[PDB]
Every structure is written in C-alpha cells, then in structure tokens.
Amino acid sequence: NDIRTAADMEHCADEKNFDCRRSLRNGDCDNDDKLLEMGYYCPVTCGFCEP
Numbered sequence: 001n002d003i004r005t006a007a008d009m010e011h012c013a014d015e016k017n018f019d020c021r022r023s024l025r026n027g028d029c030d031n032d033d034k035l036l037e038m039g040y041y042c043p044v045t046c047g048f049c050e051p
Helices: 020-025 032-041
Strands: none
Touching: 020 032
C-alpha cells in the first residue's frame, strides 16, 4: 500500500554493453566529463549507486 514502490530506480546496475571495468581503471569515475556517463552507464561501478 506504500506508494514508495512507484520508483523502480531503487536498483542500479552497471551497463553490460559498456566496459565499466576499463572505464573505471581509466579513471572515468574521476573524470567530471564522464561522471554523468558513469551515473548512467556504470552508476554502480563508479560508486554512485548500489547493485
């Protein structure tokens, strides 16, 4: 009955088609220019969300 379940973004996952591992070692999470790309492509890999 709680409407807090309307949000389905509670679970974040890394992109399967995006190489977050390579982007992570490349410091992609440390690049402000890619910070948005990580929150979108690999929010979990950069530590912006949970798996």
